[PDB]
Amino acid sequence: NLLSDKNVAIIGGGPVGLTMAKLLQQNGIDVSVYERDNDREARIFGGTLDLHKGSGQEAMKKAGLLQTYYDLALPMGVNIADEKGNILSTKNVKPENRFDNPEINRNDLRAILLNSLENDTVIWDRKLVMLEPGKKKWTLTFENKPSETADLVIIANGGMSKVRKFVTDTEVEETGTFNIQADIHHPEVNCPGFFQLCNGNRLMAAHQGNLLFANPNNNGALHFGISFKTPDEWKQVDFQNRNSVVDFLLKEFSDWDERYKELIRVTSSFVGLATRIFPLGKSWKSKRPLPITMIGDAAHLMPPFAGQGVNSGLMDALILSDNLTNGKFNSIEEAIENYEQQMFIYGKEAQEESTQNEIEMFKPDFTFQ
Ligand SMILES: Cc1cc2c(cc1C)N(C[C@H](O)[C@H](O)[C@H](O)COP(=O)(O)OP(=O)(O)OC[C@H]1O[C@@H](n3cnc4c(N)ncnc43)[C@H](O)[C@@H]1O)c1[nH]c(=O)[nH]c(=O)c1N2
Known part of the structure; x- marks a missing residue:
């Protein structure tokens, strides 16, 4: 099949890269994740993530991890308040909606995904600084660590990635x-x-x-x-x-x-x-020297204020993993092209919604009411 006797390098062990690794590894693919973090005990600063039915939850379901997510997540309501401390609205979680998007701690989500991978899938203390295409394999250069090779590179190292130029000249704004x-x-x-x-x-x-x-x-x-x-x-x-x-x-x-x-x-x-924002506009580069693509915030970083973010990235992992393993494509490049074409549609819709939402919410007269 497409990846038989070939290996995949995922750059970045965030929620998207680790999900991509599990979805490939459970199909018998030789995959490594290169993560700059020194060790798995690194605390991730940030709020919680919530996975949506049809995107983030669909990726966890395909991986056999949906119940593990539900078990470590917390359904939470929302209060809207004014600057004086008046509660203007209280929307408690109704038991029928408790599976809709429960909140999970980012370290808990990383632990679920790491525990699901084979030992030594993630190579810690590996900061990718450069790629070079060979005849058939990429050479990966790391900060102060020996090089590695792969038949396919998946850039999943977040919104500020500096290893995107084989895919696109687009700049973060x-x-x-x-x-x-x-x-x-x-x-x-x-x-x-x-x-x-x-x-x-x-x-x-x-x-x-x-x-x-x-x-x-x-x-x-x-x-x-x-x-x-x-x-x-x-x-x-x-x-x-x-x-x-x-x-x-x-x-x-x-x-x-x-x-x-x-x-x-x-x-x-x-x-x-x-x-x-890492804006999706014109298509990415065609005719790349070897197979490479990007997923998650590396592909489509956008403002988070309306709850866009990780679900688009988990949909990327689900689509690309299906295309690489479903036996329908004649080449890895065609599997990639199909994922990118799909991601440009839902990604541009998400970025459009995120940006419009950012405009509306930062008008000096906005209140969530
Ligand atoms: C303030 C705020 C608030 C929110 C959000 C963002 C922000 C800024 N988000 C967005 C959400 O956090 C985001 O979409 C995901 O973390 C993206 O996951 P990725 O795995 O793509 O990147 P992510 O950035 O999470 O992971 C990248 C990984 O790659 C590693 N790395 C980086 N450079 C590397 C290199 N050169 N080599 C190797 N590894 C490298 C990093 O260490 C990291 O582990 C969000 N989303 C959402 O859905 N709901 C929300 O409520 C919020 N809230």
Whole structure:
């Protein structure tokens, strides 16, 4: 068949790359994942992920992992609040919808996927820096580690990938929004008023161009994110200096309730990130020297504010893995072309929705109401 006596290199062990590896490996394909992280115990900073019926859940179902996801995920409702702490809307999880998109911790999702792979599928401390096409095989160059070869390379190393040029000359762009994220440990003790306002639900609030998103129970930690249009002055806050970030945020949140200000004051450290997009437009390069493609945020990074992100990437893994293993294609290149053509349609729809949603939500008069 297409991959008999051939091997596949996946670049990046995020949720998308590890899913791609499981879907190929369960079909008897020789596949390795190269992951820059030093070891499997690396904590992944970030909020939870939720898998959707028909995309992320379909990939887990094909892998035999859907029940494992359900068992480690948490169905969560959503509260909409104003800047004064008034709950404007409470949507609790109804038992009939409890399988719709339960929330999973990113380390828990990585553990499910790693435990599903054969020993030594993931090669840790392997930061890909360059590719070179040979006669039949790619040579992979890693930072300060020996080279490897593969018949097929799948780029899955996230939105800021610098190994995309064999596929496309498209560049990542800033969208003009900015995100500050943090975790609070023991939130029932350290931000009790804000914790009680969430009342076991996710919470969202918007006032004068500032958005706040919180999850009060990411494996017992509260995760929150504040998003706004990137200030022109920054076209001036040191994210290593918590006192500088606190000062900036308390000026921005000056007319919000003290339950929100308490969140800012008690946070031990903050992470800042400009919103970026890897825009799908014109098709990627045709006639590449050897078989290569991209999946996940490497293919279609987009703003996350409407819940686009990992589900598009898991759909990529499901489509590409099916094309490589279903025996219908005459070549790996044709299997790749078919996946890319499909991904350009659902990916452009997702990016269009994400970008329109970002425009609407950052108008200075928006409220989730
Ligand atoms: C603030 C915020 C909030 C959200 C989200 C993003 C952001 C920024 N997302 C998006 C979601 O997190 C995203 O789509 C997925 O993490 C993409 O998974 P990937 O595996 O493609 O990349 P991901 O970035 O997760 O993984 C890439 C992997 O490759 C590795 N790597 C990088 N460079 C490498 C190199 N050169 N060599 C080897 N390995 C390398 C990295 O270490 C990492 O393990 C989201 N999505 C969603 O569905 N729901 C949500 O609620 C949110 N929320």
